[PDB]
């Protein structure tokens, strides 16, 4: 709406303050009374560092001050502002903060609360201007397209600037999980000018906004002031930003369900003592405390030097797979199992069942030896390719062991092997079941009630192999399917096939989280002398 511009601004001074005991919120909605709860989550640690951003300006001698950088939104934010009058009005959430990616705004319009998640073309300095104590203009964005979410709440503030010593303190925390953005609110009246006030405060939830947004950056919208003229000047305000950390605290509830005080575990040995006994008052004596002063944050991963892509082309996009009674084995080794390259092909799997491992944890785990078995079945015989099944295929053609570790793949191929080369067979009429991972390529002529009929014209003697009647224009089932069975083996042997994880640099004498060929754990690494 015609965003104003600024020519010269002073460099931000990132002065750092201390937050005494602020930054605690209601972590759930369960109603409690007169109980002490030990909870784990993302909280602001006590006596942490807060970075301040000022906005004051004089008539001459100094340049304008507008500290609105792209603050990262890592795991959560603690936003505390100590303005007088009303200078800080809302925030901007997004990832790139341009019009090629969706971004959200939550700001006080002056006469309304505006929440929009659109493709915003933000100007260089988002602001809104007032003149003569009245809402003149809003200069946040220029264009907004391709969006659905829009909420407007009636509200009213006084835009007239004042003077004093920052009588107001308003604080919020923000976090987004599972597509919901959470906003908490608290307010109290203080009298400080250029320092963060001390004390203990609890934040109460006011919003739960359902937009699925990739939020990684953050920006603050401010206000400009004029002495009833075209030129605009800033006013005195300052806000503080803190980042949430994964840690444990102890919360105490009274009989009305409110939080009177909280203890941040792993701050000093006194809080750790209260954190284990689950009490605020401790009797005298000596107590055995548990471990809380440990924050393993660094991830170290070590994988071998295997770099070539693994041959998924000659095992999926091949020609003339054998029939089920004459299935073939393939040994796969010294490759990188990247399953994402199969997305580019035109074939889609209708069966992706895995047994010994989870399908999601296949890029992290690595195997000592893998094998592949491939054949062609009838289409409704695919459900017989599983541990402990019964049927024609599971008894006479291909049997899997019940202690199977691996995955089963299947996809319909009706346009490639239904027209020519239709020599697909399956074995009927066998004397006894088959063992796991075994085959019999034999064409002996089957006679019931004792073998060796030696002629097809006799009574009761039949061919063992029956042909699949594969032809186009048939239903689903009686249509050829290509099946690949992968068998995994996780041992103490050296690894041969390992998937796509980028290795990092080794670090020692630190409590870290390591990963050595799918051997994730927690501890310190020290040079050894073992053999």
């Amino acid at each position: 709406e015609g965003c104003g511009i600024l020519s010269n601004k002073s460099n931000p001074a990132l002065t750092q303050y201390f937050s005494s005991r602020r930054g605690f919120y209601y972590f759930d909605d369960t109603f409690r009374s007169s109980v002490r709860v030990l909870t784990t989550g993302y909280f602001l640690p006590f006596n942490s560092n807060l970075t301040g951003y000022s906005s004051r300006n004089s008539v001459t001698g100094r340049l304008i001050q507008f500290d609105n950088p792209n603050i990262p939104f890592k795991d959560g934010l603690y936003f505390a502002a100590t303005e007088r009058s009303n200078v800080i009005r809302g925030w901007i959430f997004g990832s790139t903060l341009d019009n090629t990616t969706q971004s959200a705004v939550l700001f006080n319009n002056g006469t309304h609360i505006v929440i929009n998640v659109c493709n915003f073309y933000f100007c260089q300095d988002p602001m809104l201007a007032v003149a003569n104590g009245s809402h003149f203009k809003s200069w946040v964005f220029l264009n907004a397209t391709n969006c659905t979410y829009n909420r407007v709440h009636g509200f009213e503030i006084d835009p007239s600037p004042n003077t004093g010593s920052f009588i107001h303190l308003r604080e919020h925390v923000f976090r987004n999980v599972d597509g919901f953005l959470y906003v908490y609110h608290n307010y109290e009246r203080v009298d400080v000018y250029d320092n963060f006030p001390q004390g203990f405060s609890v934040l109460k939830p006011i919003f739960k906004l359902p937009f699925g947004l990739n939020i990684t950056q953050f920006k603050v919208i401010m206000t400009l002031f004029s002495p009833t003229t075209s030129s605009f000047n800033a006013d005195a305000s300052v806000y503080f930003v803190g980042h949430l950390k994964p840690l444990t605290m102890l919360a105490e509830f009274d009989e009305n369900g409110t939080i009177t005080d909280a203890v941040d575990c792993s701050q000093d040995p006194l809080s750790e003592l209260k954190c284990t006994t689950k009490s605020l008052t401790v009797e005298k004596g000596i107590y055995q405390t548990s471990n809380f002063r440990v924050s393993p944050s660094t991830e170290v991963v070590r994988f071998p030097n295997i770099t070539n892509l693994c041959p998924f082309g000659q095992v999926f996009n091949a020609s003339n797979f054998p029939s089920v009674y004459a299935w073939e084995r393939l040994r796969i080794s010294d490759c990188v199992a990247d399953y994402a390259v199969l997305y580019n092909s035109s074939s889609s799997f209708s069966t992706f069942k895995c047994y010994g491992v989870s399908p999601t944890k296949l890029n992290d785990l690595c195997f000592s030896s893998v094998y592949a078995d491939y054949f062609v079945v009838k289409g409704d015989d695919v459900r017989q390719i599983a541990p402990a099944q019964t049927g024609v295929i599971a008894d006479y053609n291909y049997k899997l062991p019940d202690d199977f570790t691996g995955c089963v793949l299947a996809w319909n191929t009706n346009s490639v092997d239904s027209k020519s080369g239709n020599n697909f067979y399956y074995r009927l009429f066998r004397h006894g079941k088959i063992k796991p991972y075994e085959r019999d390529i034999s064409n002996v002529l089957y006679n019931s009630a004792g073998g060796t009929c030696s002629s097809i014209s006799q009574l009761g003697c039949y061919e063992p192999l029956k042909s699949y009647g594969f032809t186009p224009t048939v239903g689903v089932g009686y249509q050829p399917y290509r099946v690949v069975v992968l068998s995994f083996e996780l041992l103490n042997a050296p690894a041969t096939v390992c998937g796509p994880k980028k290795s990092t640099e080794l670090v020692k004498n630190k409590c870290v989280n390591f990963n050595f060929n799918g051997l994730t754990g927690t501890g310190v690494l020290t040079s050894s002398t073992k053999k």
């Binding site: 010994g356 491992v357 989870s358 999601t360 944890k361 992290d364 785990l365 996780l490 799918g518 051997l519 994730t520 754990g521």
Partner: protein, 50 residues
């Protein structure tokens, strides 16, 4: 005899939590972590009793 009970499956796929947690997703993890937790808790109960 208490430190040697940590090498027991207790009906799980492995006696090591790292083998279970790295090979299975989070939903299938609790049904096999619970068996190890109950077995180790039972061992602690027995040790305290004697």
């Amino acid at each position: 005899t208490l430190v040697k009970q940590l090498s027991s499956n207790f009906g799980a796929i492995s006696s090591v939590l790292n083998d279970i947690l790295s090979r299975l997703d989070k939903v299938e993890a609790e049904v096999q972590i619970d068996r190890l937790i109950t077995g180790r808790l039972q061992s602690l109960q027995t040790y305290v009793t004697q």
